[PDB]
């Protein structure tokens, strides 16, 4: 809901912290041999029937934000994440809420090689949380099809948890995948 | 005066021209797993995220001339889910219903339901990542949450607020009924909670 610096949010007291990450990789694949995938962005279907980024609650008095994220990624995505290090340099932004509960959400973005993403998908089915906390991994379509709705716009009509949709839109800008006008167009198209 | 999406008999749907045919399936298996050690999964129902950003059931377009509806389905399932599907039966006994539509398409959709063993579902999930359609027509497999969480929205009702292709949402509701997972009044409740 509201922006806040990492350092600032880390000085707070009585707040619940959560760390989530977008793992992505460039791709040369083309849907139907014509529509470039451009980049693979991973999200998941949660136990609560909503889409979200992998990650979760982190007790900052016990462990760092990066340590907590790491532990949650392994449980959710599998041991493939043991070879993947999401660090402080991968940290992007934090948002804060007071109502309904005092919550800080930290968003990380980490680029990987396509083969690493593919290996993560392969081993996610053997993750501890597969079929429970995590109901499956999905890739985010970045393109808009000819009917001007299929793909990204339609995708944004799904049910996202918390500020995950805002985080995705943020990543689309920061990774320079879509310009501000293109984002507005995809948002408009999803609105009708 | 225009027609709308409506139920149609298999025989009738096959006895006409100008309409495209599609076949999709719900593959499912009983499970003893429990979420948070207390919420029974009860059953694993496979759906997927499509290339078009919508949720749907695996399957696709089928040529009524070439092979049977059963045959066309099994072929499409193999491209979407991987080679494990080649060994999967799928007969007329797995056929369930058909819907005809004209609205900006003119299409007939056939829905199938087939029970498999849990390990068979698990195998398909593992092999789906190496299927021809992975990362293309198929953006990932998902399991349908059947339970409703304590806040009375999380789980199936929130799941039902996602973006579903065509009549896949009706097909899912049909399945929850025919498999005796939920009564009609329970189905009406999840819809009500999802619309809230």
């Amino acid at each position: 809901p509201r922006n806040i610096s990492r350092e600032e949010s880390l000085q707070l007291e009585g707040y619940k912290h959560a760390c989530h990450a977008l793992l992505h990789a460039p791709s040369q694949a083309k849907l139907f041999d014509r529509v470039p995938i451009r980049r693979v962005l991973l999200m998941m279907m949660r136990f609560d029937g909503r889409l979200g980024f992998p990650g979760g609650f982190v007790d900052t008095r016990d462990i760092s934000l990066e340590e907590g994220l790491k532990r949650e990624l392994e449980e959710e995505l599998g041991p493939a994440l043991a070879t993947v290090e999401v660090t402080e340099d991968d940290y992007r932004s934090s948002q804060v809420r007071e109502h309904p509960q005092k919550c800080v959400t930290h968003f990380y973005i980490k680029e990987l090689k396509l083969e690493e993403i593919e290996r993560i998908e392969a081993e996610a089915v053997n993750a501890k949380d597969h079929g429970l906390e995590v109901m499956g991994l999905i890739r985010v379509p970045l393109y808009t099809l000819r009917d001007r709705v299929g793909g990204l716009p339609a995708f944004l009509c799904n049910n996202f948890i918390g500020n995950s949709k805002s985080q995705l839109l943020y990543a689309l800008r920061s990774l320079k995948l879509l310009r501000e006008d293109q984002i507005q167009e995809v948002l408009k198209a999803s609105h009708r």
Side-chain angles (χ1 to χ4, degrees), chain A residues 1-83 85-94 96-100 102-175 177-191:
Chain A
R2 182 157 47 77
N3 285 4
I4 186 167
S5 80
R6 178 180 173 145
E7 181 172 70
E8 207 98 294
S9 68
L10 291 177
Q11 292 171 356
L12 293 171
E13 291 277 343
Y15 280 79
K16 196 154 187 58
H17 289 272
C19 300
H20 298 271
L22 167 57
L23 307 183
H24 67 99
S27 160
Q28 308 316 305
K30 291 185 191 186
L31 174 73
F32 308 140
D33 308 299
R34 205 201 69 68
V35 178
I37 292 302
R38 309 182 54 204
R39 195 170 288 276
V40 175
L41 274 66
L42 286 184
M43 295 188 81
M44 63 197 223
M45 177 58 75
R46 302 151 42 90
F47 65 99
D48 60 5
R50 310 179 169 100
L51 296 183
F53 285 105
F57 294 122
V58 175
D59 183 340
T60 154
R61 288 170 303 172
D62 186 27
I63 63 182
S64 75
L65 294 171
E66 285 69 35
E67 180 57 29
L69 174 61
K70 180 176 179 313
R71 294 183 189 187
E72 186 57 56
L73 297 177
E74 176 169 299
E75 284 186 26
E76 291 186 16
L77 306 174
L81 262 295
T83 69
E85 54 298 293
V86 182
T87 71
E88 287 187 65
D89 304 321
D90 300 320
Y91 162 84
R92 235 33 114 221
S93 65
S94 303
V96 63
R97 253 196 165 179
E98 282 80 8
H99 317 282
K102 303 188 162 199
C103 294
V104 184
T105 301
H106 310 280
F107 186 50
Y108 292 69
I109 299 179
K110 189 179 179 70
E111 183 179 50
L112 304 172
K113 312 281 158 47
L114 187 57
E115 91 80 32
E116 300 178 85
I117 287 290
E118 293 168 347
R119 179 149 46 75
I120 291 184
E121 292 178 319
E123 291 199 17
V125 309
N126 291 310
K128 174 191 184 157
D129 293 9
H130 179 75
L132 295 167
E133 296 83 8
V134 172
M135 290 300 169
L137 299 198
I138 61 97
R139 297 183 171 198
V140 178
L142 297 183
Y143 46 82
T144 292
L145 304 165
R146 262 179 193 63
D147 67 4
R148 304 186 321 171
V149 182
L152 188 53
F155 181 74
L156 291 165
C157 293
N158 285 294
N159 195 356
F160 297 80
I161 186 70
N163 67 333
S164 57
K165 189 174 185 176
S166 146
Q167 297 177 333
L168 175 61
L169 292 176
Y170 168 86
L172 299 177
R173 231 299 81 191
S174 82
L175 299 184
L177 297 164
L178 287 73
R179 46 183 186 256
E180 248 320 301
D181 42 273
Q182 285 180 308
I183 281 175
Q184 285 320 294
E185 173 51 17
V186 301
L187 281 176
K188 194 183 180 177
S190 76
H191 278 58

